[PDB]
Design a protein that fits this description.
Two copies of one chain form a homodimer. Chain A is of the alpha/beta class. Chain A contains eleven helices and eleven strands. The first copy, chain A, is 39% helix and 20% strand. Bound molecules: chloride ion, fluoride ion (F) (2 copies) and magnesium ion (MG) (8 copies). Chain B: It is found in: Cytoplasm.
């Protein structure tokens, strides 16, 4: 039975780790041969979930073509967010909830994207479609992904489907979603103890917006000022990445997850397009974005329109 | 509120019938959809609309003057879609092709399955939403499946396609084999067709690596009947190659009873057809035994060969 690898994006988050584990479980329970893997270090929010539910971290890989011919992507599609040698393997399936870009196949495939708040909400439907029981620990990881992506049901990407899926999965997992979820989210927002290099990379994604090359990184914090007081250090590492990767823009979004507001720090030739996108004035490279917490819903679309 | 649903340029039975069927499902669920088309209805699709007493979808050239959002069926690539596709939001895609030249600003509902026909996916969607398929609509969906599968002979045809067709033929009240052989024959009637029509009726454009390609297909019950028009075919094909700056125009002339095709290849990259199929072009043509599917048996190997 031909082996496949399943993985999410570079700089993995809880949905990218847990949705890879869950979809590999659904495949293997149906008699196939899948291994969930990861493309970077597990963050502290995800580690809390894996520890709580007694599950192992997926194996770390740098490339896939040395191992397999076919892969499945979860929680992303764009080539520059994926594994370094993505061109060298066949993408058999994608299960995702993002915009589509920089993604091509030579052959027909199973591509399933729904504009819901979490990839795991889609995988929940797929377990039921295939008459596979969800084990307690698997449901716990799927719940963890929904809580992470929805910021405990506060994010504007959260839908009635995500809420319903979380209710089902919390019951299967044997946990109170609010109590568990608060503890998990707090494990991820712990950060006056992280390097600025980690801050700008632990939830960074690259994009192309028209002709322009862009990186958008986000930090969950419970306090904007204990990030903002490090602006000189943040500018030094961000400017280095801008030069090395030839970026037109690096946008750091520092989100207060308990107030649902964000501070932007924008560096690069196209920093003024942030002003157009959010109707905002950059002063000393920053601006407050009130209400903005979602990169896929509230940052990527307007930044595209402003840049074009 | 108002949305348009449509398939590819040079519409086939799946593109017309899946647009009609998905609009029906949206409308039965309380939404506001109209199915439209991007080109003239072919003789196969016309046979189906006459048989099931259904009108042809309204022909449109642009969408942005009418609506803000659209739904694509049976395609995704921009160059196969409506000319002003960049000026509207794509809300959903239901499809069974490779993905390319397709980008959105926002998340969307994208549902592609590597099955034999878009209508096979829509059949599942009616069930997921608990909506009854009307007799006339089931016949159109059936027509789409028979068309894309060449009466269950194409290698794209899966067990899901066969199962869908069996349910829909029962709802439609027809024998699939008898109706299907007749419908397919209606599209294989090339007697009143100009060579301009022959190379455009079922033509699709692609970019394969960095090479610009057009692949047209024609259904026949006698390859040699179209092969005797080769000089006239080469005239119109070469005109297209020049006008569109193509690296390759490939005409695939398919014997729908024998499951073989004759290739006619014109353009700088014609020799890549020899590599893709392990054949030798003689006077610009080569027999491709077993080859009937563009999405499964032509596009992938041509892509490899041209890389
Ligand atoms: Cl009519
Ligand atoms: F995610
Ligand atoms: F089709
Ligand atoms: Mg993610
Ligand atoms: Mg996600
Ligand atoms: Mg996430
Ligand atoms: Mg995120
Ligand atoms: Mg079609
Ligand atoms: Mg089709
Ligand atoms: Mg077709
Ligand atoms: Mg076709």
């Amino acid at each position: 039975m031909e082996k496949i690898l399943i993985f999410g994006h570079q700089n993995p988050d809880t949905d990218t780790i847990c949705s890879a584990i869950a979809y590999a479980d659904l495949k293997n329970k149906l008699g196939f041969n899948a291994e969930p893997v990861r493309l970077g270090q597990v963050n502290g929010e995800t580690q809390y979930a894996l520890d709580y539910f007694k599950q192992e971290s997926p194996r770390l890989v740098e490339t896939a073509a040395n191992e397999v011919n076919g892969v499945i992507l979860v929680d992303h599609n764009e080539r520059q967010q994926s594994i370094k040698d993505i061109e060298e393997v066949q993408v058999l399936e994608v299960i995702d909830h993002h915009r589509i870009a920089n993604f091509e196949t030579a052959e027909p495939l199973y591509y399933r994207a729904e504009p819901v708040g979490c990839t795991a909400t889609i995988l929940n439907k797929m377990y039921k479609e295939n008459n596979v029981k969800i084990e307690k620990e698997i449901a716990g990881l799927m719940l963890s992904a929904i809580i992470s992506d929805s910021l405990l049901f506060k994010s504007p990407t959260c839908t009635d489907q995500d809420v319903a899926a979380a209710k089902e999965l919390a019951e299967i997992a044997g946990v109170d979603a609010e109590e568990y979820g608060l503890n998990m989210l707090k494990a991820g927002a712990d950060l006056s103890k992280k390097t600025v290099e980690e801050l700008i990379s632990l939830d960074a994604k690259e994009f192309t917006l028209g002709s322009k090359k862009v990186e958008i990184a986000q930090v969950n914090t419970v306090d904007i000022e204990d990030v903002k007081k490090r602006q000189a250090e943040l500018e030094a590492v961000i400017s280095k990445v801008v030069a090395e990767k030839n970026l037109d823009l690096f946008l750091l979004v520092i989100t207060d997850i308990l107030e649902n507001d964000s501070l932007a720090l924008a560096i690069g030739n196209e920093a003024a397009k942030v002003e157009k996108a959010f109707n905002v004035t950059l002063e000393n490279n920053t601006a407050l974005l009130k209400g903005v917490v979602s990169r896929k819903k509230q940052v990527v679309p307007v930044l595209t329109d402003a840049m074009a």
